[PDB]
Design a protein around this ligand. Sequence first.
Ligand SMILES: Nc1ncnc2c1ncn2[C@@H]1O[C@H](COP(=O)(O)OP(=O)(O)O)[C@@H](O)[C@H]1O
Ligand SMILES: [Cl-]
Ligand SMILES: [K+]
Ligand SMILES: [Mg+2]
Length: 357
Amino acid sequence: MEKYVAAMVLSAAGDALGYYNGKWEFLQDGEKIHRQLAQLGGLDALDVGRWRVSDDTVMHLATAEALVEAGKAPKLTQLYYLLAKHYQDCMEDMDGRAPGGASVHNAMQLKPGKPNGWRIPFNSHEGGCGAAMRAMCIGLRFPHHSQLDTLIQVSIESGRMTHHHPTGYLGALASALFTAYAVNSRPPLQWGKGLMELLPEAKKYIVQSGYFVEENLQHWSYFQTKWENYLKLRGILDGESAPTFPESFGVKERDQFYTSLSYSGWGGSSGHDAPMIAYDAVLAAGDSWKELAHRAFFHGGDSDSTAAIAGCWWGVMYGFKGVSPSNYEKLEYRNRLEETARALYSLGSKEDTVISL
Ligand SMILES: Nc1ncnc2c1ncn2[C@@H]1O[C@H](COP(=O)(O)OP(=O)(O)O)[C@@H](O)[C@H]1O
Ligand SMILES: [Cl-]
Ligand SMILES: [K+]
Ligand SMILES: [Mg+2]
């Protein structure tokens, strides 16, 4: 129970903490964020009562609520109607939340109701993190090994309702997949290898689905190459070694590393690097919420987004252990988050099968 509740609540807490009503998301100097954090009394002193969640939580809740509404043994046509509907409707709750461009534009284009009304054309600039930031609960719903093909399909299609570009929707796959791994207590050092092994199954799905096959295949290597290079850097390509971090890896060094991971200069703003930064933070932090926050919530990149992902994976594994109550007790939508988590638990914690397209 607690771990699903923590998954949803701490994902949202991370989003709020990284965001700081826009002040910290858009600060590009991680050292300055850390100084302002110290002046506020440090992470344990932060009270989120007045720290709004951003687009990341509003969309993650929208994915979660659609999964709960679709119920047991759902038809994927029904689940995709609900997802499209929630994604479109939730754009009405983005005031002061700094929504991402593909997210807001394409959610408002959707036509749920029409057969395939949730599909959009391939686009060269739909590689943002907006698909990845809202996908983690898919793993909460479909954690069992038997459901892997379902997790792959739903993460991908949920993503390309707004991000029809492998760098975008493969980020959704990573977010959902690593959540499932966390639910099953798979050691985090194994997770990157799991993703690499499953990319060919994601391709099989994209190919057979039959939409913009050539464009998808032509853009496929970016995601896979960036992840391979990252896993090799950490010494974890094959999932059979503890990670190795650089000697000098303080706040400034991490800002620089995150920028190096990035597509166009804003670290964690894409489908490849949002989950990658969250993962790097989980790997280093272990059971330390504070270390997780310092690495995934407070940096010069797209920090609420890396936070939303990291906080979900971490809460799944550790619950609320060692988290200051002020970091979540008065969090926006706390009640909706807890209620959806419990309903996802009831669905997720007993293995069922979907009716495919
Ligand atoms: N082909 C692409 N590959 C990787 N990242 C991309 C691509 N196209 C755009 N981006 C990234 O998406 C980010 C902006 O995404 P955004 O406006 O926030 O859309 P969304 O936020 O809904 O994902 C930019 O920082 C840019 O780096
Ligand atoms: Cl601190
Ligand atoms: K930032
Ligand atoms: Mg955000």
